[PDB]
C-alpha cells in the first residue's frame, strides 16, 4: 500500500452500473476467494432471510395466503429476534407484501431463466424485482439495459417471468 490523498471517484449511479467501491462486481470473501457480487431480488431475499430465521429458531430450540404468511412471519420474527428490530419487522412485512415468487421452485426457475442473458447481477435483480409488461417499460425503469439486450429477448424473458408468476 502506497500513499493516498484526494482522488476523483465516479459518483454512484445505477444507470451506469457504478455501484461504488464496496459494491464492485468482483468481491473477495472472508476465505480470500474471489466471488461475484451477490445481488438478490425481493423474492430471493425474502426466502434467504426466512431460511436464516428458521435456522436460528432451530438452533435456539435445539440448544399460503398473504395474511397467514404475514402473521406467521411476524410471530416468528418477534420470537427469534432481539430488540430494536423495527427495521427488520418493516423489511419482512414489505418483502412479504411485495414479493412475486413464493416458493423455492419458482425462485429457482427464475434464477435458471435469468442467468442465461449474462447481465449484471444488479440488472437481473432489478428484472426479478420489478414487474414489467413491455420491453419499453423495462428499458425506462432500468436505463442500464439500453444497448445490452435486444427487445426480442427482453420481450420473451418478461413474458416467461409473467408466465411463472405465483397464483
Amino acid at each position: 500500500r502506497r500513499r493516498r490523498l484526494k482522488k476523483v471517484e465516479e459518483e454512484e449511479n445505477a444507470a451506469t452500473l457504478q455501484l461504488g467501491q464496496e459494491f464492485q462486481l468482483k468481491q473477495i470473501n472472508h476465505q480470500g476467494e474471489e466471488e461475484e457480487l451477490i445481488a438478490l431480488n425481493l423474492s430471493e431475499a425474502r426466502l434467504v432471510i426466512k431460511e436464516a430465521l428458521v435456522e436460528r429458531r432451530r438452533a435456539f430450540k435445539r440448544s399460503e395466503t398473504r395474511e397467514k404468511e404475514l402473521e406467521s412471519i411476524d410471530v416468528l420474527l418477534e420470537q427469534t429476534t432481539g430488540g430494536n428490530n423495527k427495521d427488520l419487522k418493516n423489511t419482512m412485512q414489505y418483502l412479504t407484501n411485495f414479493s412475486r415468487f413464493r416458493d423455492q421452485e419458482t425462485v429457482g426457475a427464475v434464477i435458471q431463466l435469468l442467468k442465461s442473458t449474462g447481465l449484471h447481477p444488479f440488472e437481473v435483480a432489478q428484472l426479478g424485482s420489478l414487474a414489467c409488461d413491455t420491453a419499453d417499460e423495462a428499458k425506462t425503469l432500468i436505463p442500464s439495459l439500453n444497448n445490452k439486450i435486444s427487445d426480442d429477448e427482453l420481450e420473451r424473458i418478461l413474458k416467461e417471468l409473467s408466465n411463472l408468476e405465483t397464483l
Binding site: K139, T140, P143, N146
Partner: protein, 131 residues
C-alpha cells in the same frame, strides 16, 4: 439554424464537442446539453416556439441524413416496412400482384408522410400488423 443550437445558441466554435440529436416526434434539432438539462428528470414539452408535442429522452437519436424531409420519409418507411414486408415468392411469382402491392405500400407511405389520411392509414397499419 446553421451550426448552433436554436435554444441555447451554443456555437460549435465555443463548443467543439457539441453534438446535435434529433427526435422523430417533431424532428427538431437540439444539442445533447439541452437534452440532458431539459429531459433528465422526465418527459416534457419540446422547447421550441410553436411546438407543443411531448417527447422522451430515450427516443432521441443521431441524424443520418442532412435533409430533415428525407429523414422523416425514411423513418416512416422503416415503420411501414416493419409491418408490410413481403417478397416475390409471397405471391407465387405473380409480378402484377406484387407490383400493385408495392404501389399500395408506396401510397400508404406517401399518405403518412404528407398527412393525407392519418387516422385511416394508422388504423390500417394497426389492423395489418395483427393480420
Amino acid at each position: 439554424n446553421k451550426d448552433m443550437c436554436p435554444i441555447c445558441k451554443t456555437d460549435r466554435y465555443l463548443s467543439p464537442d457539441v453534438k446535435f440529436l434529433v427526435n422523430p416526434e417533431c424532428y427538431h434539432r437540439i444539442c445533447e446539453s439541452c437534452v440532458d438539462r431539459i429531459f433528465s428528470l422526465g418527459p416534457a414539452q419540446c422547447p421550441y416556439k410553436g411546438c407543443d408535442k411531448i417527447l422522451r429522452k430515450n427516443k432521441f437519436k443521431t441524424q443520418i441524413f442532412d435533409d430533415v424531409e428525407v429523414e422523416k420519409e425514411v423513418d416512416i418507411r422503416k415503420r411501414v416496412f416493419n409491418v408490410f414486408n413481403k417478397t416475390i415468392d409471397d405471391f407465387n411469382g405473380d409480378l402484377v400482384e406484387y407490383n400493385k402491392y408495392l404501389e399500395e405500400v408506396e401510397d400508404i407511405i406517401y399518405k403518412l408522410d404528407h398527412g393525407i389520411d392519418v387516422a385511416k392509414t394508422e388504423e390500417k397499419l394497426r389492423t395489418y400488423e395483427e393480420l
